[PDB]
Amino acid sequence: VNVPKTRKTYCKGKECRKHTQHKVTQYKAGKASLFAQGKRRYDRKQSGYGGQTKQIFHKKAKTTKKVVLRLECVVCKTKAQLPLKRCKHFELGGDKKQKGQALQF
Amino acid sequence: GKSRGYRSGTRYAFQRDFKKHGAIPLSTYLKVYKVGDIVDIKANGSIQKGMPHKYYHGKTGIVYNVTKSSVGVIINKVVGNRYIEKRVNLRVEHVKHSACRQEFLNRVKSNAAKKREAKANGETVYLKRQAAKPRGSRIISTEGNIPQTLAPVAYETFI
Amino acid sequence: MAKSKNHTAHNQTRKAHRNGIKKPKTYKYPSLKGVDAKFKRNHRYALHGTAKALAKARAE
Amino acid sequence: ARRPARCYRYCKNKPYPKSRYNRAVPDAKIRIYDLGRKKATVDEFPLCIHLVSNELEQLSSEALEAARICANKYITKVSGRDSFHLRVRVHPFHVLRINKMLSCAGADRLQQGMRGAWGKPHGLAARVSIGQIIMSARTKDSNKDVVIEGLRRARYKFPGQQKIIISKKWGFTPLNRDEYIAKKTNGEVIDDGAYVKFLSRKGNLEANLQQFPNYQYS
RNA sequence: CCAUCGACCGAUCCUGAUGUGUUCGGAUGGAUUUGAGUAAGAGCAUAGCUGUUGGGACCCGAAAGAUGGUGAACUAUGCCUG
RNA sequence: GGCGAAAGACUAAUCGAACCAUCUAGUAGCUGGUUCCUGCCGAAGUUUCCCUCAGGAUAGCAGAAGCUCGUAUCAGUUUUAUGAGGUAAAGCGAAUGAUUAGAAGUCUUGGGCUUAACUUAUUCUCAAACUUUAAAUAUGUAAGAAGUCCUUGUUGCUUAAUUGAACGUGGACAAUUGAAUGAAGAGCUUUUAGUGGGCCAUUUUUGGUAAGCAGAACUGGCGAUGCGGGAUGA
RNA sequence: UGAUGGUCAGAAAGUGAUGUUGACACAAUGUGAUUUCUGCCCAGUGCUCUGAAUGUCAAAGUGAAGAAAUUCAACCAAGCGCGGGUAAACGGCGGGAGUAACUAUGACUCUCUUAAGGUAGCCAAAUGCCUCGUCAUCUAAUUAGUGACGCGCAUGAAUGGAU
RNA sequence: CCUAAGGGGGACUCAUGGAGAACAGAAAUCUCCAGUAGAACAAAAGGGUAAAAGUCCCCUUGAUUUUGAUUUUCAGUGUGAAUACAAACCAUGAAAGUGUGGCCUAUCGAUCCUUUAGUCCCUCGGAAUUUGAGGCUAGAGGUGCCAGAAAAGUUACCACAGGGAUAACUGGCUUGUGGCAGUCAAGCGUUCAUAGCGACAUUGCUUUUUGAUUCUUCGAUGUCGGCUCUUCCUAUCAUACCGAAGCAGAAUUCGGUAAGCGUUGGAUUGUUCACCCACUAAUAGGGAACGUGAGCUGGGUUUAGACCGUCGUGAGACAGGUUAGUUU
RNA sequence: GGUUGCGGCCAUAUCUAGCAGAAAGCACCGUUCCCCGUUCGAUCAACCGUAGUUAAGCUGCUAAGAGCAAUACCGAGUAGUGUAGUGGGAGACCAUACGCGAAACUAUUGUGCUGCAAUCU
RNA sequence: GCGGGGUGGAGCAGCCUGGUAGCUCGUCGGGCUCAUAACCCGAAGGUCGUCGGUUCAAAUCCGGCCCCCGCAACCA
RNA sequence: AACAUGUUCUU
RNA sequence: GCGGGGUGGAGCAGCCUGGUAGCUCGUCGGGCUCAUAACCCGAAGGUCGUCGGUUCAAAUCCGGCCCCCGCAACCA
Ligand SMILES: CN[C@@H]1[C@@H](O)[C@@H](O[C@@H]2[C@@H](O)[C@H](O[C@H]3O[C@H]([C@@H](C)O)[C@@H](O)[C@H](O)[C@H]3N)[C@@H](N)C[C@H]2N)OC[C@]1(C)O
Ligand SMILES: CN[C@@H]1[C@@H](O)[C@@H](O[C@@H]2[C@@H](O)[C@H](O[C@H]3O[C@H]([C@@H](C)O)[C@@H](O)[C@H](O)[C@H]3N)[C@@H](N)C[C@H]2N)OC[C@]1(C)O
Ligand SMILES: CN[C@@H]1[C@@H](O)[C@@H](O[C@@H]2[C@@H](O)[C@H](O[C@H]3O[C@H]([C@@H](C)O)[C@@H](O)[C@H](O)[C@H]3N)[C@@H](N)C[C@H]2N)OC[C@]1(C)O
Ligand SMILES: CN[C@@H]1[C@@H](O)[C@@H](O[C@@H]2[C@@H](O)[C@H](O[C@H]3O[C@H]([C@@H](C)O)[C@@H](O)[C@H](O)[C@H]3N)[C@@H](N)C[C@H]2N)OC[C@]1(C)O
Ligand SMILES: CN[C@@H]1[C@@H](O)[C@@H](O[C@@H]2[C@@H](O)[C@H](O[C@H]3O[C@H]([C@@H](C)O)[C@@H](O)[C@H](O)[C@H]3N)[C@@H](N)C[C@H]2N)OC[C@]1(C)O
Ligand SMILES: CN[C@@H]1[C@@H](O)[C@@H](O[C@@H]2[C@@H](O)[C@H](O[C@H]3O[C@H]([C@@H](C)O)[C@@H](O)[C@H](O)[C@H]3N)[C@@H](N)C[C@H]2N)OC[C@]1(C)O
Ligand SMILES: [Zn+2]
Structure with a gap:
């Protein structure tokens, strides 16, 4: 999968509400905070005696993930997220396919 | 494993007629349909959009x-x-x-x-239709039409 | 050890005909949910205007 | 070894030919279908005698091979090799399958029984209807009884019942003997090796007239 | 009571008047959206059969698990005296 | 826990973890049992999901209570009109694939007058996963009042439009209101039981040498059912 | 294991057993009289030693930022990792080709390869499938017995070998 | 898997064959003709496609935004996928049009938790500010046992609830396999198919082999062999009487009626089986719940002890070997 | 009746091989300043209708023509099939009763029809 | 039912992760030696078991088939 | 530093 | 019940897939030596163990008669 770095699509920002130029980057999840309620609950439940109190997933089966594109409008700086189909290789702004050239093995 | 996809079993039903491939004649596009019209459903295999499921192939609605x-x-x-x-x-x-x-x-x-x-x-x-009734009486002339006798024929082989 | 019958439709039409097979009831006016939104929108106005006109002519 | 023929006698299964879907199929035991003087002219062997199946069954290629050898050998011994033309008229295209269960003591330890029982190719058979010709021989009228006995011997090599029928037609042609003589004397047949070609009243008239120069247009 | 087209209240999307703690306000008009709503109340209480869930839960039935006690008059091993 | 010159031995007829009381009527998708009569109705072993496969939930089949009405339009059926289909059969000098035999050419193409190939007209035989053709049985729809025709109202939809589309006002057409036969009437709702091992026969049909074997299709049965016959027998 | 100890006990204790003991002792294992012997392997799993030099490493402590909760950074014990030893610790202990003046066989050679490639012995043995192995002896006749043989499915050295 | 292999427009025509052009030939590139698709279209197979859906050129991002309706699977729930509209905003084209990913039929994922985008909107409940936290809408991180527990063995020391819904005997169906008998007649048999044999084929029978199956029995039908004893079958080894011969005699071989009568003693082995020694008229084969354990025996198998080899880190395993093991 | 433009059904229209064709139309045909596209004015573009030609396209006719289409005292009431029986047969299978009913084969016939507009010896 | 092997005359790499077949020994030519071995300088030699498939490209990636050596075949 | 070998039988 | 095999004097090809049997060791001759050994040059040597069938054509396929060497042959 090669996806270009810029994309003219619809913008939902109240300033635009039209097709505008967007900057394309790949989404990456942030660091899990230690103060999210789910994590404060988990740490309290894990303290003391009793061992592991929650399940731990083991049977992984997927070999890929879904790629999320982060599109930022160059005008109002509103973002949009757009997920792609599963792929093993992804790059932004790779060099386009040239059609009809001799391979130089 | 079994296979029950959307177009499974449609090998012959969705084929085009012999020597009837290619472009659709324009009469298909010039017909006018109105709410309440009764229509026969027949999938055309060359038009992949708006296709019926195989169940509705040959149904009328x-x-x-x-x-x-x-x-x-x-x-x-x-x-x-x-x-x-x-x-x-x-x-x-x-x-x-x-x-x-x-x-x-x-x-x-x-x-x-x-x-x-x-x-x-x-x-x-009277406007009601009627089923076919038994025939009435009649007289048959034998002028140039003398009854001709037939008999069962003997067995013959031709091999 | 637990091999058993896999599938049959035996007795299934017999069950279906005990109380079936009943056609859906037909009505004079159908529901316009699922009809083209532009047609349905204007049909609303056409019915509204017709009632107003009949309510008028009946006065005279 | 080979199972007895009763295990594959009747047409119980759909035809199962060699194809893209069963490739590992052995050759039939019968390889030759035309014996005797197979280059003889149509007018040389006016008499046709058929061996006809009276069963809807399967004939193994082994039976076809044995019957062919028997009939050919007897007729050649009595009347010589050039006095007839024998044609096996069925070809074994149906593959026979086998499951191959072990015959040693304690096989039940080793094998799985009726689990996954789809069989391996085992042999080839020909599927014959009731009234289907199995073999055919054309010879001269004076060689009737020799060929009849030759086919009589070949019958015992086949399961079930078969009939030996003397045909009314000229050789392997579809014409009765009188019809063939009429077409011949009218210039409407020419030789084409072991067979003939008949006159057509369709198509290009110039080519028809050239091809049968002795044709009596009537 | 039923089929159907509307109207009203709340959620959602849009619009955005006189005005203003100039960032609030939200008049007015829209939208194949959404609700266990409205549109001249129907409920509350007692009782009965049947059905449901927790209870020993239709009756009898484990192999187990736990808490607190009683045994070396048999027998195992050491020690003491015969 | 003990004790074991070691057998998991012995530890009061108890030992691969004593005895006693209590928690304790421990839990059991499993086995057994489950107590009066008559009357009326009367099943299922199938669908989907489930660490589901000796179990549940879910839909179906069954009972009960009725309710709104009273011949309205309904039916495991025919007739008439009109669709759909690729099985049976058929076919292969028709496409694809398989397949026996000569013959005439071609030698410009490779061998030894040939030997095979190639081309042409022929010839024998085939296909669950081939096919031009193509049944029988089975299958969709229609046979009017919610209809037809005439005039012209509504609208923000539609047309170049005074065009249409959808829904209407007013007028007309009456028991042949637009085929047959039947109809212990039609419509509507709530609620809940059991069941979720099936099995047999004719026909179609898959695996298997075959089986009172294993697995599907439609219908009828047995299960749940006695009675006359088949001596006897779901 | 030299007592500020080893091995073991106890909920704890100003608590115990060995211990009225001290390496000719106590504690923990393996093998199993005598005779004759006890081969090679520390790559694996363990056990053990070394830490001046050293990647990672908790809580506390330290520094920075912030209004602060907090965040970030450095530093950082043992352990891990790095390096050495140890088989009477657990255990382990090879293939493919060619070659001598009849033939056969292969002392000899080539090659791949391990941590090491089963040594001394012993054997169809209570351990050998094939197998009732083959030869001999024993008998009229022996799937039995015994003696031999040994490319030994899968013998073998204190998981002790042979006597 | 693909920024094109998605969208739009345009131009062109593919496999293959024939005939021609320096190096050049079977295969280089150039020319013309024939060419219904015999090509190509990411990937299985089927369907579809020729002024295209294929090849090449040009421009693009509709692979976008909002939320409803529908089809398949179906409970007419979820998930996956797909269809036709409404309202926006765009691409392309002269234009009609076409486009909501890939020509169609597969290519995928709840609750809780975390994380991101949006409104920057709601809440932190004595009142406020700024941090922090919590909500609402839409995605991502994953459950492949794919409607979605967090999970290694061994028991030959064993337990319980059950199961003939299910294996290990007999019996029943079947008869492949085992065993026995026919039909034909290529050959063998000094000549001669059939005295005696008999290939290639082919029809059967039996239930003394072994399977296949799972109908009966798991609140139990005692599970090898031998010993003992009776009886039955005939597919006859001997004995009676006969027919045939490649029957001179002697001997032998093929066959018929025949089950009346017999069919043994021993070495090795737990053995059935096997194998020798020997006698004999002959040393036939089978059944009776694979006859026969309240008739025995207990060598074997198959509880608990113990040894070895190979395997296993280990507990332990082993249609591998070995020794000891209550028969009511 | 011919022809052109736009068509409907989409071979009775297609294919091969000959021949013929007045009027108009269509066509080939001439040219390259301009818009435009090419390696090439060949195709595409534009200009003239002026110099020519029915040679080709196109139209029709011919062929015991190939293909296609249609019919049938052609094959055949055959193959197949619904229903029935305590029918026949060891069975494979077969007949009968009340119904439905092919394909190949054979023979014969045909070879576009037509809508809107314009135009023509 | 599985698993590995198949590459110059011999024993082995290269596979994996496509674009070149590498190593030792051997064979052949010349040299050194009286000669031979050793040693020195040179040269040949595997279309990758086989039939297909895909790929622009096959020893390699994807199936069938052939040969060689092995593991598993348990509860009664 | 390296350096192995020389068919049989005589005249 | 099977599994291989029977080709010169002896070890092996040729078979898979019909038409075309070769090398190796060993014997019969010559070359070299003073004569041998070795070494080299040549030459003969198997109609395929046997009987059958298929075939235009069989060492090659399909049966039978022998010999060679083995793999498999209750049970609870
Ligand atoms: C905002 N657009 C509205 C459109 O939403 C719709 O209005 C719905 C209306 O149909 C719903 O009402 C519907 O559902 C209610 C039910 C909830 O009880 C019924 O009572 C009512 O009959 C039914 N029509 C009403 N609940 C909300 C409106 N916005 O009506 C058409 C419209 C005017 O375009
Ligand atoms: C006579 N006035 C009536 C008034 O009574 C009322 O009628 C309601 C009617 O609207 C309701 O019905 C309504 O709501 C139902 C409901 C199931 O959602 C809908 O299905 C239905 O379409 C809708 N019309 C009906 N259930 C009760 C009457 N009293 O509202 C409509 C009205 C015309 O104004
Ligand atoms: C012509 N097609 C026929 C089809 O009609 C049908 O035939 C049945 C036949 O099979 C029936 O016969 C069947 O049933 C009977 C009995 C139990 O009824 C049996 O005795 C008989 O063996 C059995 N074949 C016969 N009684 C009527 C025909 N229509 O089934 C057989 C078939 C060949 O397909
Ligand atoms: C200034 N006037 C505003 C008016 O614009 C409108 O505001 C809505 C606001 O309510 C919506 O927001 C609403 O819905 C979102 C969510 C469900 O999308 C919620 O997060 C939010 O708390 C809720 N108020 C917002 N998304 C758009 C504004 N125009 O209504 C609220 C208001 C205050 O009157
Ligand atoms: C008492 N001694 C006898 C001894 O005589 C001999 O007996 C055989 C016997 O074994 C044979 O029998 C054997 O062999 C026949 C085969 C030949 O048909 C088999 O059918 C049978 O089952 C088998 N037991 C039998 N046919 C003859 C007796 N003399 O061998 C067995 C024995 C027990 O040792
Ligand atoms: C030692 N070199 C020899 C060379 O001498 C020759 O050898 C022949 C050999 O081929 C012959 O061998 C041949 O002989 C005749 C041939 C002449 O037709 C054949 O009939 C025979 O079958 C075949 N073996 C053999 N008879 C003599 C050797 N010297 O050819 C072979 C060879 C190996 O190169
Ligand atoms: Zn923007």
Whole structure:
């Protein structure tokens, strides 16, 4: 999968509400905070005696993930997220396919 | 493992007729459909958009909706111990008018005309159709038609 | 050890015909949910205007 | 070894030919279908005698091979090799399958029984209807009884019942003997090796007239 | 009571008047959206059969698990005296 | 816990973890039992999901209570009109694939007058996963009042439009209101039981040498059912 | 294991057993009289030693930022990792080709390869499938016995070998 | 898997064959003709496609935004996928049009938790500010046992609830396999198919082999062999009487009626089986719940002890070997 | 009746091989300043209708023509098939009763029809 | 039912992760030696078991088939 | 530093 | 019941897939030596163990008669 770095699509920002130029980057999840309620609950439940109190997933089966594109409008700086189909290789702004050239093995 | 995909089993049903491949004749696109029309559903394998499911292939139904390039058709489907009303969106390539209805509307017109003729004449006519009745009595002449006797023939081999 | 019958439709039509097979009831006016939104929108106004006109002519 | 023929006698299964879907199929035991003087002219062997199946069954290629050898050998011994033309008229295209259960003591330890029982190719058979010709021989009228006995011997090599029928037609042609003599004397037949070609009243008239120069247009 | 087209209240999307703690306000008009709503109340209480869930839960039935006690008059091993 | 010159031995007829009381009527998708009569109705072993496969939920089949009405339009059926289909059969000098035999050419193409190939007209035989053709049985739809015709109202939809589309006002057409036969009437709702091992026969049909074997299709049965016959027998 | 100890006990204790003891002792294992012997392997799993030099490493402590909760950074014990030893610790202990003046066989050679490639012995043995192995002896006749033979499915050295 | 292999427009025509052009030939590139698709279209197979859906050129991002309706699977729930509209905003084209990913039929994922985008909107409940936290809408991180527990063995020391819904005997169906008998007649048999044999084929029978199956029995039908004893079958080894011969005699071989009568003693082995020694008229084969354990025996198998080899880190395993093991 | 433009059904229209064709139309045909596209004015573009030609396209006719289409005292009431029986047969299978009913084969016939507009010896 | 092997005359790499067949010994030519071995300088030699498939490209990636050596075949 | 070998039988 | 095999004097090809049997060791001759050994040059040597069938054509396929060497042959 090669996806270009810029994309003219619809913008939902109240300033635009039209097709505008967007900057394309790949989404990456942030660091899990230690103060999210789910994590404060988990740490309290894990303290003391009793061992592991929650399940731990083991049977992984997927070999890929879904790629999320982060599109930022160059005008109002509103973002949009757009997920792609599963792929093993992804790059932004790779060099386009040239059609009809001799391979130089 | 078993396979029950959307077009499974349609190898022959969705084939085009022999020497009938290629472009659709434009008469298919010039027909006019109205809500209440009765239509036969026949999938055209060369038009992949707006296709019927194989269940509705060869079914007849009522038009209930008319859009840019397609009609909505109502079909009754036996599901268990009752019928379910189904609504199928079909591009016009997969649809055709039903001819029995045109015949029936013709009969409506003829019945009205005959009734009016009788009313102007001063009498009453019968408009109900009738099944074929047993034949009446008749006399058969034998002029140049003397009964000719036939017999069963003996067995012969020809191998 | 637990091999058993896999599938049959035996006795299934017999069960279906005890109380079926019933056609859905037909009505004079169908529901316009699922009809083209532009047609349905204008049909609303056409019915509204017709009632207003009949309510008018009946006065005179 | 080979199972007895009763295990594959009747047409119980759909035809199962060699194809893209069963490739590992052995050759039939019968390889030769035309014996005797197979280059003889149509007018040389006016008499046709058929061996006809009276069973709807399967004939193994082994039976076809044995019957062919028997009939050919007897007729060649009595009347010589050039006095007849024998044609096996069925070809074994149906593959026979086998499951191959072990015959040693304690096989039940080793094998799985009726689990996954789809069989391996085992042999080839020909599927014959009731009234289907199995073998055919054309010879001269004076060689009737020799060929009849030759086919009589070949019958015992086949399961079930078969009939030996003397045909009314000229050789292997579809014409009765009188019809063939009429077509011949009218210039409407020419030889084409072991067979003939008949006159057509269709198509290009110039080519028809050239091809049968002795044709009596009537 | 039923089929159907509307109207009203709340959620959602849009619009955005006189005005203003100039960032609030939200008049007015829209939208194949959404609600266990409105549109001249129907409920509350007692009782009965049937059905449901927790209870020993239709009756009898484990192999187990736990808490607190009683045994070396048999027998195992050491020690003491015969 | 002990004790074991070691057998998991012995530890009061108890030992691969004593005895006693209590928690304790421990839990059991499993086995057994489950107490009066008559009357009326009367099943299922199938669908989907489930660490589901000796179990549940879910839909179906069954009972009960009725309710709104009173011949309205309904039917495991025919007739008439009109669709769909690729099985049976058929076919292979028709496409694809398989397949026996000569013959005439071609030698410009490779061998030894040939030997094979190639081309042409022929010839024998085939296909669950081939096919031009193509049944029988089975299958969709229609046979009017919610209809037909005439005039012209509504609209923000539609047309170049005074065009249409959808829904209407007013007028007309009456028991042949537009085939047959039947109809202990039609419509509607709530609620809940059991069941979720099936099995047999004719026909179609898959695996298997075959089986009172294993697995599907439609219908009828047994299960749940006695009675006359088949001596006897679901 | 030299007592500020080893091995073991106890909920704890100003608590115990060995211990009225001290390496000719106590504690923990393996093998199993005598005779004759006890081969090679520390790559694996263990056990053990070394830490001046050293990647990672908790809580506390330290520094920075912030209004602060907090965040970030450095530093950082043992352990891990790095390096050495140890088989009477657990255990382990090879293939493919060619070659001598009849033939056969292969002392000899080539090659791949391990941590090491089963040594001394012993054997169809209570351990050998094939197998009732082959030869001999024993008998009229022996799937039995015994003696031999040994490319030994899968013998073998204190998981002790042979006597 | 693909920024094109998605969208729009345009131009062109593919496999293959024939005939021609320096190096050049079977295969280089150039020319013309024939060419219904015999090509190509990411990937299985089927369907579809020729002024295209294929090849090449040009421009693009509709692979976008909002939320409803529908089809398949179906409970007419979820998930996946798909269809036709409405309202926006765009691409392309002269234009009609076409486009909401890939020509169609597969290519995928709840609750809780975390994380991101949006409104920057709601809440932190004595009142406020700024941090922090919590909500609402839409995605991502994953459950492949794919409607979605967090999970290694061994028991030959064993337990319980059950199961003939299910294996290990007999019996029943079947008869492949085992065993026995026919039909034909290529050959063998000094000549001669059939005295005696008999290939290639082919029809059967039996239930003394072994399977296949799972109908009966798991609140139990005692599970090898031998010993003992009776009886039955005939597919006859001997004995009686006969027919045939490649029957001179002697001997032998093929066959018929025949089950009346007999069919043994021993070495090795737990053995059935096997194998020798020997006698004999002959040393036939089978059944009776694979006859026969309240008739025995207990060598074997198959509880608990113990040894070895190979395997296993280990507990332990082993249609591998070995020794000891209550028969009511 | 011919022809052109736009068509409907989409071979009775297609294919091969000959021949013929007045009027108009269509066509080939001439040219390259301009818009435009090419390696090439060949195709595409534009200009003239002026210099020519029915040679080709196109139309029709011919062929015991190939293909296609249609019919049938052709094959055949055959193959197949619904229903029935305590029918026949060891069975494979077969007949009968009440119904439905092919394909190949054979023979014969045909070879576009037509809508809207314009135009013509 | 599985698993590995198949590459110059011999024993082995290269596979994996496509674009070149590498190593030792051997064979052949010349040299050194009286000669031979050793040693020195040179040269040949595997279309990758086989039939297909895909790929622009096959020893390699994807199936069938052939040969060689092995593991598993348990509860009664 | 390296350096192995020389068919049989005589005249 | 099977599994291989029977080709010169002896070890092996040729078979898979019909037409075309070769090398190796060993014997019969010559070359070299003073004569041998070795070494080299040549030459003969198997109609395929046997009987059958298929075939235009069989070492090659399909049966039978022998010999060679083995793999498999209750049980509870
Ligand atoms: C905002 N657009 C509205 C459109 O939403 C719709 O209005 C719905 C209306 O149909 C719903 O009402 C519907 O559902 C209610 C039910 C909830 O009880 C019924 O009572 C009512 O009959 C039914 N029509 C009403 N609940 C909300 C409106 N916005 O009506 C058409 C419209 C005017 O375009
Ligand atoms: C006579 N006035 C009536 C008034 O009584 C009322 O009628 C309601 C009617 O609207 C309701 O019905 C309504 O709501 C139902 C409901 C199931 O959602 C809908 O299905 C239905 O379409 C809708 N019309 C009906 N259930 C009760 C009457 N009293 O509202 C409508 C009205 C015309 O104004
Ligand atoms: C012509 N097609 C026939 C089809 O009609 C049908 O034939 C049945 C036949 O099989 C029936 O016969 C069947 O049933 C009977 C009995 C139990 O009824 C049995 O005795 C008989 O063996 C059995 N074949 C016969 N009684 C009527 C025909 N229509 O089934 C057989 C078939 C060949 O397909
Ligand atoms: C200034 N006037 C505003 C008016 O614009 C409108 O505001 C809505 C606001 O309510 C919506 O927001 C609403 O819905 C979102 C969510 C469900 O999308 C919620 O997060 C939010 O708390 C809720 N108020 C917002 N998304 C758009 C504004 N125009 O209504 C609220 C208001 C205050 O009157
Ligand atoms: C008492 N001694 C006898 C001894 O005589 C001999 O007996 C055989 C016997 O074994 C044979 O029998 C054997 O062999 C026949 C085969 C030949 O048909 C088999 O059918 C049978 O089952 C088998 N037991 C039998 N046919 C003859 C006796 N003399 O061998 C067995 C024995 C027990 O040792
Ligand atoms: C030692 N070199 C020899 C060379 O001498 C020759 O050898 C022949 C050999 O081929 C012959 O061998 C041949 O002989 C005749 C041939 C002449 O037709 C054949 O009939 C025979 O079958 C075949 N073996 C053999 N008879 C003599 C050797 N010297 O050819 C072979 C060879 C190996 O190169
Ligand atoms: Zn923006």
